[PDB]
Design a protein around this ligand. Sequence first.
Ligand SMILES: *C(=O)CCCCCCCCCCCCCCC
Lengths: 186, 207, 179, 156, 191
Amino acid sequence: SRSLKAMGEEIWKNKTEKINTELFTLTYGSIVAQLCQDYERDFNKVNDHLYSMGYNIGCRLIEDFLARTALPRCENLVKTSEVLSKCAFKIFLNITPNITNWSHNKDTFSLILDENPLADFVELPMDAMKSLWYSNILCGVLKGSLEMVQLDCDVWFVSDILRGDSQTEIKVKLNRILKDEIPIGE
Amino acid sequence: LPKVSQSVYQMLLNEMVPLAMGIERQISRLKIEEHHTVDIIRSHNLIHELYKADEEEKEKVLARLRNIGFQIGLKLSELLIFSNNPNLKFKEMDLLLIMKFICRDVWKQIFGKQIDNLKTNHRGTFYLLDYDYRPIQSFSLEEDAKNEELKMIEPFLEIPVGIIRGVLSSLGYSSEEVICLASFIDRPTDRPKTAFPKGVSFHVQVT
Amino acid sequence: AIETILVINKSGGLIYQRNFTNDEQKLNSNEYLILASTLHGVFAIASQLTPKALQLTQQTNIENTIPYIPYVGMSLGSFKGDDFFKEPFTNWNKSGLRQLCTDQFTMFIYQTLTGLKFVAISSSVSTSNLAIQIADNFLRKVYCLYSDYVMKDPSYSMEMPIRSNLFDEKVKKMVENLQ
Amino acid sequence: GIYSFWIFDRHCNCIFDREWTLASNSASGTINSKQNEEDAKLLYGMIFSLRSITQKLSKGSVKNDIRSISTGKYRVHTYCTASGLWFVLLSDFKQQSYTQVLQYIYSHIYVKYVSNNLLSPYDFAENENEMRGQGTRKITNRNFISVLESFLAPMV
Amino acid sequence: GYDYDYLFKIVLIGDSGVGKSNLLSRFTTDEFNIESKSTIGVEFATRTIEVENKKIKAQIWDTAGQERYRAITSAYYRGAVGALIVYDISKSSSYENCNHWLTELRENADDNVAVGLIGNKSDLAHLRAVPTDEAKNFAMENQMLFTETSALNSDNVDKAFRELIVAIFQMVSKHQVDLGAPKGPTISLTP
Ligand SMILES: *C(=O)CCCCCCCCCCCCCCC
């Protein structure tokens, strides 16, 4: 029909409401701040609860992304990477992640977050400098979305600019393409 | 200036009651992420659990979500004071000007619409009336079980109360003299019938 | 632009799979048997899906008649004249799978009164009724050719696989003009 | 206009059912009643079979999906989405297709009263035992039935 | 590969829960779509065999109906030429339905249809709920072949299947017999 470029600009410019990114950042910052507050600063597995957060969010966001875009079910890692990089983030967060670090035989790749609106302004405490991720919700949302698109992936964070690394990378390695179900009529 | 999609914001802003209820479970569905088996639980399950848990845990989660909203409002305050630049003072005894600011700018920035008309005691309290209340405009259970709907949808009324409390904080009055309560007692006077039947009222007390 | 045809005798079972494509040959011969039998089964099972609004009250025995497309065929055998027929005719399968439209192709169905089924897969995607009107006429030309060159054949047992050269070359001539 | 309207989910289950009657708008269209369950599994089987045929004998690199299935008495418009959700609608011919209406349904009714409905479930099969299809946990969302009745009332 | 001369439709009809799904899973050309039993009513198996130089294709349709399939399950026998009545020697209930199954088969399917009768899972010697003697006596009264099968007792179903097809062939095989040009200049003698 049309290129994913044209689709992303068309959907973003004239088919979605808008708000200030500062306020979204503020809300997510409040969530993470209070999770730190009410949990004795157990950064080892506040990330797990944030992962559950992100999974529950993404599993029900996918119904809206497909509602607007109306793409077919992705089958191969190349098309999944292209769609995630090019329109899936462009609709919601208005960013274009870059893709590098292709693994062997096209089973894994990495999302590079050039600009992260979830962390427009944060300076973590000293104890968090090598424990917390602060953006686990994003990869949780990605996994939850791909679950309903019916392809399982282990997704995790390799690096983050917040902790001190040069760039923020999210490995999204596929595990298996689980198949559609059939009635169990004997 | 940069923007983010209202749909993802509205959904995220809706979904803290499951967060505020499941954090309590962790304090007091198995699957593997990479190597260690984490547990995840749905959102509607936790909404029902909050609906029928017991009184003290319900109150704990209510104060929990009030703290969340307090942080959000207090923290967005300074941004709004910078950007809009109203004509307020630090501790203005004229509560009408503060309430006009909250009605005009804070809600215009959080939700998409200005809040509706407001009462004026001129001595004590104030009332803020909202019609159709954007975040929960698409909530329901059943054709008949409308009585359970309003009691189950209660905790979602706290984050704007927390917003109001926080905005009043860092603008003079602290969180020991001010108290606010939300309710459905507002009735649709003449507006067109939207999905949700009842508008909401925030009763704000300030001595 | 019809790309393939195939015919089912009376109870399932493919008996003709001459594919009218330049060079595709993607589908195995064996799996077309499952294709034809599954189409037969779906034809059978869609019969008991008439909505109850029309189940008890049809009142639509005026649309079953199909108009006469003038020269759908070409430009003969037992037949003679410019065309196999001139008058309009009537539909026979009024509660069965007539069409399956799809982004890349369209499958038309024509059921003979005795029970034979003729299936026409066409790459071309006609308001979904004129397409049926073209397809029914063309498939009945194919049916006339079938009755001419498969029924009046000594070495052909009943409702068995078709193995002939007059029939396949004649239907090839029929389709190469229809595009 | 239309005669019946159906939503099926990933788990090979009927999640929403509706059938109409004579052309009165406020018709006796029994909603989500059990007798419709009998003529629902076979409808799902028919759609699944022809979808399998389409994906089988397709060509190209797009993996096409079936649009409509016409019979003598009516035609079955069907819209599929990548999340394994199928919206099916029976109707007399009377127009080219209802694909725009199905897309509007998915993008303004289901999405905005089942995916923005935090206190209502999704993936209605739960805790094993109904992911194959032997389950009944259909929707009852008052806003959903109300808006769907409102939108589909004129087109009958 | 349209080399087969004839195509015989045979129904693997039998009672639910009999293990017939595992029965036909052994002898197969298993490829393509599978698990189609619940899709409409049937799943398909095929095989080509050589019968004195006439290649014959078979079509095993495994009809199944649980509670809702009433009309199409009978309609699938429009022109069936063979039947493979499946029962299990574990419970008398499965064998009791054979009379009804044969009655429906003879009523609906082709007149004078070849019918075989296969007893699945004969390895289990702990719950033999019907004797082979009575089964054979029942087989006598209808001119219909009988056999019992097991995983360990292999080749029995295969030989019975081949012998069933070569028996059907003798019934529906019309006899077929395998049925110096003048080269040079020409002169026209037409008037
Ligand atoms: C085949 O169609 C694959 C489609 C790709 C899945 C869509 C991913 C949607 C989620 C994107 C991230 C949303 C932002 C989350 C942060 C709050």
